[PDB]
Write an enzyme that holds these catalytic residues in place. Sequence first.
Site, mmCIF file in Angstrom:
data_model
loop_
_atom_site.group_PDB
_atom_site.id
_atom_site.type_symbol
_atom_site.label_atom_id
_atom_site.label_comp_id
_atom_site.label_asym_id
_atom_site.label_seq_id
_atom_site.Cartn_x
_atom_site.Cartn_y
_atom_site.Cartn_z
ATOM 1 C CB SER A 1 -4.011 16.186 25.118
ATOM 2 O OG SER A 1 -5.168 16.999 25.247
ATOM 3 C CE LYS B 1 -4.299 -1.850 1.949
ATOM 4 N NZ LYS B 1 -4.084 -3.311 1.661
ATOM 5 C CG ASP C 1 -14.125 11.781 30.455
ATOM 6 O OD1 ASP C 1 -15.336 11.444 30.444
ATOM 7 O OD2 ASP C 1 -13.428 11.840 29.416
ATOM 8 N NE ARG D 1 -7.103 19.639 19.357
ATOM 9 C CZ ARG D 1 -6.884 18.408 19.814
ATOM 10 N NH1 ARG D 1 -7.579 17.384 19.327
ATOM 11 N NH2 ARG D 1 -5.973 18.201 20.765
ATOM 12 N N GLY E 1 -8.789 18.050 23.309
ATOM 13 C CA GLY E 1 -10.087 17.533 22.903
ATOM 14 C C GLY E 1 -11.126 17.627 24.011
ATOM 15 N NE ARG F 1 -0.366 13.130 25.113
ATOM 16 C CZ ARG F 1 -1.659 12.851 24.977
ATOM 17 N NH1 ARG F 1 -2.318 12.242 25.957
ATOM 18 N NH2 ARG F 1 -2.294 13.176 23.859
ATOM 19 C CB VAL G 1 -23.206 10.855 17.473
ATOM 20 C CG1 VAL G 1 -24.119 11.277 18.656
ATOM 21 C CG2 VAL G 1 -23.605 11.586 16.205
HETATM 22 N N1 LIG Z 1 -8.611 3.729 24.355
HETATM 23 C C1 LIG Z 1 -8.119 4.546 25.357
HETATM 24 C C2 LIG Z 1 -8.511 5.903 25.442
HETATM 25 C C3 LIG Z 1 -8.002 6.692 26.435
HETATM 26 N N2 LIG Z 1 -7.144 6.146 27.345
HETATM 27 C C4 LIG Z 1 -6.544 6.965 28.431
HETATM 28 C C5 LIG Z 1 -5.286 7.701 27.903
HETATM 29 C C6 LIG Z 1 -5.899 9.054 27.446
HETATM 30 O O1 LIG Z 1 -4.924 10.100 27.339
HETATM 31 C C7 LIG Z 1 -6.874 9.320 28.613
HETATM 32 C C8 LIG Z 1 -7.957 10.349 28.234
HETATM 33 O O2 LIG Z 1 -8.536 9.901 27.003
HETATM 34 P P1 LIG Z 1 -8.846 11.091 25.971
HETATM 35 O O3 LIG Z 1 -9.830 10.556 25.008
HETATM 36 O O4 LIG Z 1 -9.439 12.392 26.690
HETATM 37 O O5 LIG Z 1 -7.563 11.408 25.039
HETATM 38 P P2 LIG Z 1 -6.532 12.648 25.223
HETATM 39 O O6 LIG Z 1 -6.669 13.515 26.419
HETATM 40 O O7 LIG Z 1 -5.102 11.947 25.267
HETATM 41 O O8 LIG Z 1 -6.495 13.506 23.869
HETATM 42 P P3 LIG Z 1 -7.573 14.670 23.612
HETATM 43 O O9 LIG Z 1 -8.671 14.850 24.761
HETATM 44 O O10 LIG Z 1 -6.824 15.935 23.392
HETATM 45 O O11 LIG Z 1 -8.287 14.294 22.227
HETATM 46 O O12 LIG Z 1 -7.424 8.005 28.881
HETATM 47 C C9 LIG Z 1 -6.801 4.838 27.219
HETATM 48 O O13 LIG Z 1 -6.021 4.339 28.007
HETATM 49 N N3 LIG Z 1 -7.283 4.054 26.249
HETATM 50 CA CA LIG Z 2 -11.624 12.462 27.981
HETATM 51 CA CA LIG Z 3 -8.835 14.581 26.930
HETATM 52 NA NA NA Z 4 -19.303 7.509 18.958
#
Ligand SMILES: Nc1ccn([C@H]2C[C@H](O)[C@@H](COP(=O)(O)OP(=O)(O)OP(=O)(O)O)O2)c(=O)n1
Ligand SMILES: [Ca+2]
Ligand SMILES: [Ca+2]
Ligand code: NA
Length: 326
Positions: A171, A63, A247, A140, A180, A174, A94
């Site tokens: 994030s 690919k 959350d 965002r 998000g 981080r 959604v």
């Molecule tokens: N399948 C997943 C999804 C999330 N998490 C953990 C790590 C993520 O950093 C945290 C929060 O999930 P988020 O969806 O809020 O992702 P982020 O904060 O990292 O990115 P953002 O909110 O900017 O999109 O939970 C995880 O272990 N497994």
């Molecule tokens: Ca979250």
């Molecule tokens: Ca988040």
């Molecule tokens: Na969804």
Amino acid sequence: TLNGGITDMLTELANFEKNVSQAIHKYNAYRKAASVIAKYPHKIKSGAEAKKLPGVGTKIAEKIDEFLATGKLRKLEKIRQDDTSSSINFLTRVSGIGPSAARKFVDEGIKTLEDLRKNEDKLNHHQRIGLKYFGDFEKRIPREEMLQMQDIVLNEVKKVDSEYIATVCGSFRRGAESSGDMDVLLTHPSFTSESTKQPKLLHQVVEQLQKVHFITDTLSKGETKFMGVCQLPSKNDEKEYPHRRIDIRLIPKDQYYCGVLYFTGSDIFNKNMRAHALEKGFTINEYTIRPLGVTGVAGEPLPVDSEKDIFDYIQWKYREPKDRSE
DNA sequence: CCGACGGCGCATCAGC
DNA sequence: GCTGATGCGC
DNA sequence: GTCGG
Ligand SMILES: Nc1ccn([C@H]2C[C@H](O)[C@@H](COP(=O)(O)OP(=O)(O)OP(=O)(O)O)O2)c(=O)n1
Ligand SMILES: [Ca+2]
Ligand SMILES: [Ca+2]
Ligand code: NA
Ligand SMILES: [Cl-]
Ligand SMILES: [Cl-]
Ligand SMILES: [Cl-]
Ligand SMILES: [Cl-]
Ligand code: NA
């Protein structure tokens, strides 16, 4: 952006396997390939070169050869041109609608935002809120607002009990310039691995943030995890702030480090870190790291005094939160 | 029909 | 009500 | 889809 063409390609294929084929393991394989390629410091010149990386096989290599030669992939061309696959993919965006509900809805001729708004009787409470704030939730959050949000939550938590400690993760932690959504890790000396000395610890916090009108809606809520919606206050003759997903996770106070490691992410980093553990002979969750043995039964929890300790058990060397954006 | 692939909270359903 | 599956979420 | 027992 070094190999952004290729990583964008593989992410689209992943999203198709998860949402349309219902093949969670092909979804995970595409995301791993995109991830290892994204941390590669050279511009990829052939599929053969790519296949050297762990998680890139014969099929992904072919690919990459096609994309490099033509600037596109015939497979994705057709997928994009398939209205049925496109609708299914869209609906999963959604909050509360996943691959199964999306395919059910599309089999029934529901396949637009408009279609959902006039079929709300087919949606549960979670799905209705996801619909209500769909536009708001696509957006965002600038770090400047994350800061205002942090100040509100910390002040209200403090007013409930000075012994709570709230930490913003994900994030944000981080170091990202925009996020998000907001993720809040909560502890209280009353709640530990040993006993639950105080009732409704999470409840008292949620209820105060609702009392001052910061939290506006609830998606789900149990003894340790809250999933809902919030908003900053705005000035008169000033556009309202968008509603945002929040959350909150109450973690036992003595398990804070595994908790904050889990809650900082990113997700593919967690998947990749927990996979390395399994071949190192361990298993990591949000509460503990354990060694495993011969019957498939995990051992007793190992001692932990910081995030670094966890990296140590698996012979990875430490990584600052800003370097966990796999 | 090689089989594992990260781990779990909350909400709901199937067969007791 | 339970256990074990499913579905969607972090 | 990839890797490894
Ligand atoms: N399948 C997943 C999804 C999330 N998490 C953990 C790590 C993520 O950093 C945290 C929060 O999930 P988020 O969806 O809020 O992702 P982020 O904060 O990292 O990115 P953002 O909110 O900017 O999109 O939970 C995880 O272990 N497994
Ligand atoms: Ca979250
Ligand atoms: Ca988040
Ligand atoms: Na969804
Ligand atoms: Cl699969
Ligand atoms: Cl393409
Ligand atoms: Cl810990
Ligand atoms: Cl545990
Ligand atoms: Na490879």
